[PDB]
Structures are given as structure tokens and as C-alpha cells.
Amino acid sequence: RTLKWSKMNLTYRIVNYTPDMTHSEVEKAFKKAFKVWSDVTPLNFTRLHDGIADIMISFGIKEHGDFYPFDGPSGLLAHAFPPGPNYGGDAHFDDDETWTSSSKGYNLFLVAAHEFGHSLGLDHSKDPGALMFPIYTYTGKSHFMLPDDDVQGIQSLYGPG
Ligand SMILES: NCCNS(=O)(=O)c1ccc(-c2ccc(CSc3nc4c(c(=O)[nH]3)CCC4)cc2)cc1
Ligand SMILES: [Ca+2]
Ligand SMILES: [Ca+2]
Ligand SMILES: [Zn+2]
Ligand SMILES: [Zn+2]
Numbered sequence: 001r002t003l004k005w006s007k008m009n010l011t012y013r014i015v016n017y018t019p020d021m022t023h024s025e026v027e028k029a030f031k032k033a034f035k036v037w038s039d040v041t042p043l044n045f046t047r048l049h050d051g052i053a054d055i056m057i058s059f060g061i062k063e064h065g066d067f068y069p070f071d072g073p074s075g076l077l078a079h080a081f082p083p084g085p086n087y088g089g090d091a092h093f094d095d096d097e098t099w100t101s102s103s104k105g106y107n108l109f110l111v112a113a114h115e116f117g118h119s120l121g122l123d124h125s126k127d128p129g130a131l132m133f134p135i136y137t138y139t140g141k142s143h144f145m146l147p148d149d150d151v152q153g154i155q156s157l158y159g160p161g
Contacts, residue, residue, distance in 0.1 A: 004121045004157045005083045008042045011053035018059045020099040021108065029101060030057060033112035036131075036144075037120060040151045041158040055119050057112075059095040070094040077106055077136070080115040089119045107138055113146075122153055 012034065017026050027047075034045040047053075063069040066087060070076055073096045080091035091112070098105030110131075117132050125132035130149040 002121065002157060003082055009044050010055060011046050011048050012055040012057060013048045013053040015056060015058040018095055018099050021101065025101055029109040030112050032109050033116055036113045036146050037116065037154055040146060040161065041154055042161050043158055055089045055091060057091045059093050061094065061096050064092065070096065072096040078111050078115045080118040082118060083121050091115045091119055103138060103140060106136065111136065120154065121157055125149055
């Protein structure tokens, strides 16, 4: 046995938005991020506008209400908790960073896909070409294809769709 969600139908809520991007650009970016995993697993993700959801996403700075505070510009950038109740599964992004949909700063989609991998029970990868490798890089690929090391890893938890 490993650590994982018992249900295949998960809900997320975007609690607050970063000033660095428009509501629509944020929402598009996170939705594409969950799709990364939904496409290769039986998992399904639906967004809630209110109330408590399984994966609760928020932006914040410094001491933000958990034992893992951010540090301002540079340094740490996001973290997410493994599956479980309450804080379990949630994702936090440091809003002293610069979030973008481009080549500049941290690309919010890529970092969300990474952080959501942790939310589903994945650990970091040893393959520098994985999405779950602990070092951020931006490859500027024409379109994004989820690398094989990570499709293997998430499927070990949930199986193919
Ligand atoms: N517990 C340590 C936390 N350190 S952290 O907060 O500073 C941190 C560090 C790195 C990442 C992070 C690392 C890698 C990625 C993904 S990199 C990437 N993968 C792929 C492509 C690409 O262009 N870039 C193409 C396909 C796979 C995202 C976030 C997140 C938080
Ligand atoms: Ca930081
Ligand atoms: Ca939660
Ligand atoms: Zn946090
Ligand atoms: Zn990570």
C-alpha cells in the first residue's frame, strides 16, 4: 500500500488570485494542470466556487497559516500537501514570486502540474526530464506532453483511464 486518494472524483477551489495574471489566465492554467493527470488516470476534477473542496488552492506570502512559511522573492516558490483531510491535498503558491503564462518568471501551469502531482501522492523524481524533478526549468516546448516517468508514477497509484 501507498498514500493516495480513495475517491476518483476530486474537487478544487481557487480561493484567491495572484495579481500577476488575470482571473481567466489563472483558471485556465490550473485547469490545464489537473488535465495533465486526468488524461492518464481515472481521476476527474471539478472546480467549486464556494465551500470546502478536496484540493484548496491559494496564493500567499510569508507566514500564511501552516508550518511551512514562504520567504519572499526567490527562494521557495510553492508547496502542496499529500492526500488526506483538511490541509491534505492543498496547494500554496508564494505570491512574492512572479507567476506567468510565458517564458518569464515561474510558469504557473508547469508549477501547478508539479505541485498537483504532490497533491495526488507523488514524490519527487530522479529523472531531470520528469515533471516531478525538484528543479524548475522551462523548455518552451511547442505543446506539452507529460513525460513517461511521471505517467508511470501516477498510474502506479490510480491506473490507466
Ligand atoms: N520541498 C522543496 C520545495 N522547493 S521549491 O518550493 O522551491 C520548488 C522547487 C521546484 C519546483 C518545481 C520543479 C519542477 C517543475 C517542473 S519543470 C518542467 N518539466 C517538464 C517540462 C518543462 O518545461 N519543465 C516539459 C515536460 C516536463 C515545477 C516546479 C517547485 C517548488
Ligand atoms: Ca519565495
Ligand atoms: Ca483539503
Ligand atoms: Zn503553505
Ligand atoms: Zn515539489
